[PDB]
């Protein structure tokens, strides 16, 4: 009413895809034969970027088939929900080693075979499943126990086997032997953000950036979680060499902004760095081109 | 009936006439941060015409050899435009891009382009090195090109250990040479956090890769460029402080 | 609940001294009085505040933070005061 | 930060320096997050 | 219960706790371009946070002799803030102003101040000399002293050949040492034009004026300063363009 | 709904003094002593740049005056309502000046008493009542005719006497004899702008500007308004020394933002420039402070 | 002075916005601040030939 401008917008800022459940597999309906001009679904335009639906019924002479193909297994919950192994620790409790103690920071970008899992989608968010095997490096079971303590970012770190750290009034702690089933550990969503980042195209401070090594590069902290700290239960060293597995689980899990599969082979952890001296091609090479194996 | 188009996003009008088919990111229109998520307690602002507007980047030319070409958002725009202005003066941030590339080239000429925009476009240290103290890691000026926009050094695995070939997952639009010279995206706010610095965290890159080269019979046009028009929508600006230059 | 900040945290300030900032005339204007960093979990003057020492038993915090500001000066000696927050980015401002 | 918006303007026969003192707190919409122990105690000795 | 005040515009918040009166030039609240006046066809922008703030200028110490400062308005934000990058940006420009104007003294000091905008605020070459190829002006940095604020050099006549005493007419608040210690106006967008040039046409000017000089026994705070924080409101900007510093 | 943030202040970006019709003096009724404490019209605060409001009811004994002095004639629109010298021209035809013509640029600066009343208010809006008196250095009548053109910005100007631009095809003339009464036009408000400027801040232009003479400063066009020549009718010379005053009226005037009397003396025309060297005080010197004549 | 906690609410000093809120306060309470166990003491029970 003053000015006709400002209400226009305020009120067409309102906000501006009702897919269905799909429980079984796509059935198919017949289809004839059809001789007619201008309603062609073969020649479609993929450089617009959109999918072609010339779909079965519309090329062929089809049939009918009630397919009944269950497509439960292939959805994301069920695809992250196998454990797979994260971390080793070497809790080389010994003579030598004076430190009865070995600290280790969450990193699943360690290990390959759960790595390539999860860049498939950018940003995931999720409740994990822990699980802590335990062994020797023999494979042997003892009658021996231990403490697994997880040490916050901004915790005191231990410093040694008989350290105040492991009082652990506040920090949560895991208390188990080692002639026992594995500890398992359901853990949260604890991201300080609202949702993970594998990926980010930045860096975490401002400031001058140099350009003959960027160490500071695609390390988002919103997914950097702290540490993960072990020691056996005892005051004084008792000699074995110790190396525990852990494991962890997928549960409840949200994608979001799928990403391509990694080809390449891993060379770091926190880095994607690839070689270019040896570009590992996907597809085996072949003959010639008219020679399909 | 469908080949013309008509944009037009503040002062700007942008039309083309033989490229056709507007692809939209994922389905979902660009749009303000609803108040039910928002952290930020401040008021933002919406300037919503200033920054609105379709800022062109420069010219790329085409060589029969040639690799590809790559660029940042919204890090080609922090030293021009009000929008840059605007960033330089603001810690959050937040918008939603109208991306387009254009690319002339005759009706007797051939070639193709890969078009797409790629979300939280990290790059990776070429070498075969794995100390990690000496591991080889991009330059700042390779992974923030700025307005110019830097070229790829092998584009097969898109500098990233990701293949080109299942590169269509993301929101793309081909350019092709005997049907269309001309490509474009709609991208909404991609980001995990509802707002981000806008000097620091780039939201997504920008791939123009030529996949077909450009052949051409000796006699015509020897020299095509590539220029991408850019249009940021229902952009946001909290937390004002001084200037920073990066 | 406000408590104190040990905002005068600095070598040759021991005692109690501690928790107060001096304010002088000056001379000449455009002139900084103090600063600190607002982070709590960070070292610094928040040590002091019970906020800053209940904030460390926990990893992450959001939320509003407030600071007040008594003034200990006589009754009729006056004077204003600019107190400035600064978002993230560059280091503390050179002038104000 | 804190400035000097125009000066501390005295009167005669009072002194020209003065003390403020800062005292902070959380705003209603302070939230907290999972626990962790602080970082203040170093004990080394048990205490006997 | 009057002599405390709390004005808050954008991410700032001042309050002066002595002064009293806010003083409204002319009775008229800045309001925007209405419809059926505004000659601008592309739509303007209205960020009204990132612009609407207290920038606050440079302190003037205040001496016993002293003559008088000066100001002009939006001259003296064109280099700093967002509102200097957005009029660089912006042949067209309309704005309200919230003035606030701050001298701190003691209850044993004395001595007043005038505080007065004047609407299209010339000033005059000072010299007897008629020829009009030789005639005396003013500089640039004289008349569009920027951020800073020049001095007088008479100020009973205005440096523009007007009479201070006659100088109330305009809207105007004194500072007087005994009772406020600061002042305050909001003047509404006082020119002919819907809209006009930031950069060229200043819309008003701003005197402080030391009428009765400052006088403290000796044994005191001996420099007082003045400063004025300044808040533009309802503000507008139309025509895009580069930047053009002058 | 979408977002509670813009719907409230476009719903709230509304609009944000109702005075009378005075048409006499303002009366006064009585008023007895009033002894009480609390309520003093007197002790105002001029500080805040209020006019105080203490009224002669308030202070003293006063009496009942139904007043009747009419107040009409103290408005703007009959305050400007006089006719006043604007500009000369010197029309020396003769046997030594070869022009026959002589052209003036309108600028009401270059008198001073129609000047310092306009110089009253900022920006004004009105119609014009020109009116061109006639007559020779002698102040002799003649049997002659003479032309006046007005000649706008943009238009030729004319060269000589015999010129063209006297064809005058779309360029309002004046053709009037010297034995006549003067000639009388009423003229519009035909600024490009929507009001009157007898200031500027600034410059027309954009570009540097030097600081060692200003020329272009305070120099707003939208004021600036053209050119107005005369002749005498006739392709060959009369030997006369002719000089005709040019008189406006203000009519529909429309003041704003009054501005102070100027008290120093003028000194140029497009510009307010005072000497440093004579600053003409007010107020006239007395003997002492306590000594009113 | 009065000891009172001043309530500036961040509505009351500048150009707010809405934020309808979601952050859980169920950790912070006192009932799930203790609820970790924690040492207490130590013995030794040195049952040997001395
Ligand atoms: C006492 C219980 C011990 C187990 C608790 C350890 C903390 C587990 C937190 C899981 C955080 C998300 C999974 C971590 C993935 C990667 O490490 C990071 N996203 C980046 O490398
Ligand atoms: C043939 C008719 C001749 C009379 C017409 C002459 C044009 C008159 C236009 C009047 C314009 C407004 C009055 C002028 C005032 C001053 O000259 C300017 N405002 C600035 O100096």
Redesign the pocket.
Same mark, same amino acid.
């Given at each position: 009413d003053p000015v006709e401008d400002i209400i226009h917008d305020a009120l067409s800022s309102t906000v501006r895809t009702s897919g269905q459940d799909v429980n079984t597999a796509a059935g198919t309906a017949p289809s004839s034969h059809r001789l007619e001009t201008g309603r062609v679904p073969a020649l479609q335009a993929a450089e617009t970027g959109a999918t072609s639906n010339a779909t079965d019924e519309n090329m062929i002479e089809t049939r009918c088939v009630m397919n009944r193909n269950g497509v439960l297994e292939a959805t994301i919950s069920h695809f992250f929900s196998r454990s797979g192994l994260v971390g080793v620790v070497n809790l080389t409790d010994g003579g030598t080693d004076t430190t009865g103690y070995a600290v280790w920071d969450?990193?699943? *970008?360690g290990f390959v075979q759960l790595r390539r899992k999860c860049e498939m989608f950018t940003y995931m968010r999720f409740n994990?499943e !822990?699980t802590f095997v335990t062994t020797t490096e023999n494979g042997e079971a003892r009658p021996f126990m231990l403490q #697994? +303590? #997880?040490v916050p970012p901004g915790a005191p770190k231990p410093t040694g086997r008989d350290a105040f750290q492991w009082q652990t009034a506040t920090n949560?702690? $895991?208390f188990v032997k080692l002639t026992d089933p594995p500890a398992q $550990?359901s $853990?949260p969503f +604890?991201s300080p953000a609202s949702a993970?980042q594998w990926f980010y195209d930045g860096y975490p401070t401002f400031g001058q950036h140099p350009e003959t090594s960027n160490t500071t590069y695609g390390q988002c902290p919103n %997914? *950097? +979680?702290?540490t !993960?700290a072990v020691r056996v239960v005892s005051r004084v060293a008792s000699q074995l060499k110790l190396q525990t597995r852990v494991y +962890?689980k997928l549960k409840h899990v949200r994608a979001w902004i799928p990403r391509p599969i990694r080809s390449q082979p891993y060379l770091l952890k %926190?880095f994607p760095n690839y070689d270019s001296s040896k570009i590992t091609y996907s597809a085996r090479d072949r003959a010639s081109i008219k020679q399909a194996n | 009936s469908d080949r013309v188009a008509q944009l037009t996003v503040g002062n700007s009008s942008i039309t083309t006439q033989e490229a056709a088919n507007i692809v939209l990111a994922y389905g979902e229109w660009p749009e303000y941060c609803p108040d039910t998520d928002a952290t930020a307690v401040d008021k933002p602002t919406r300037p919503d015409v200033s920054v609105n507007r379709f800022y062109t980047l420069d010219s790329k030319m085409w060589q029969e050899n040639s690799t590809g070409w790559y660029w940042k958002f919204p890090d080609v725009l922090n030293k021009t435009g009000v929008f840059g202005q605007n960033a330089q003066f603001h810690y959050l941030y937040r918008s939603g891009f109208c991306l387009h590339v254009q690319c002339n080239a005759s009706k007797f000429h051939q070639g193709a382009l890969l078009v797409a925009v790629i979300p939280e476009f990290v790059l990776a240290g070429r070498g075969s090195n794995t100390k990690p103290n000496e591991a080889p890691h991009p330059g700042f000026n390779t992974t923030f090109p700025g307005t110019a926009g830097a070229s790829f050094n092998d584009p097969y695995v898109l500098d990233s250990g990701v293949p080109l070939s299942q590169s269509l997952i993301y929101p793309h639009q081909w350019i092709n040479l005997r049907t269309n010279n001309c490509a474009t995206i709609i991208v909404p706010y991609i980001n995990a956090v509802p707002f981000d610095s806008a000097i620091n965290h780039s939201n997504f890159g920008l791939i123009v890769v030529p996949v077909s080269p450009l052949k051409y019979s000796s006699g015509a046009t020897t020299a095509i460029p590539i220029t991408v028009t850019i249009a940021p929508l229902n952009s946001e600006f909290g937390g004002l402080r001084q200037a920073v230059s990066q | 609940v406000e408590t104190i900040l040990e905002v005068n945290n600095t070598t040759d300030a021991t005692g109690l001294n501690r928790l107060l900032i001096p304010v002088s005339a000056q001379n000449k204007a455009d002139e900084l009085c103090a600063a600190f960093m607002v982070d709590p979990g960070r070292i610094g003057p928040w040590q002091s505040t019970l906020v800053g020492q209940i904030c460390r038993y926990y990893t992450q915090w959001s939320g509003s933070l407030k600071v007040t500001f008594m003034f200990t000066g006589s009754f009729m000696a006056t004077g204003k005061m600019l107190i400035a927050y600064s978002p993230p980015g560059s280091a503390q401002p050179a002038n104000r | 930060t804190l400035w000097y918006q125009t000066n501390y303007v005295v009167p005669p026969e009072t002194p020209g320096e003065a003390y403020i003192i800062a005292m902070g707190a959380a705003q209603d919409n302070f939230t907290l997050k999972i626990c962790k122990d602080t970082d203040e105690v170093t004990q080394q000795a048990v205490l006997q």
């Open positions: 969450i990193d699943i *970008m994990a !822990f #697994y +303590m #997880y949560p702690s $895991v $550990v $853990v +604890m993970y %997914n *950097m +979680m702290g !993960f +962890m %926190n | - | - | -």
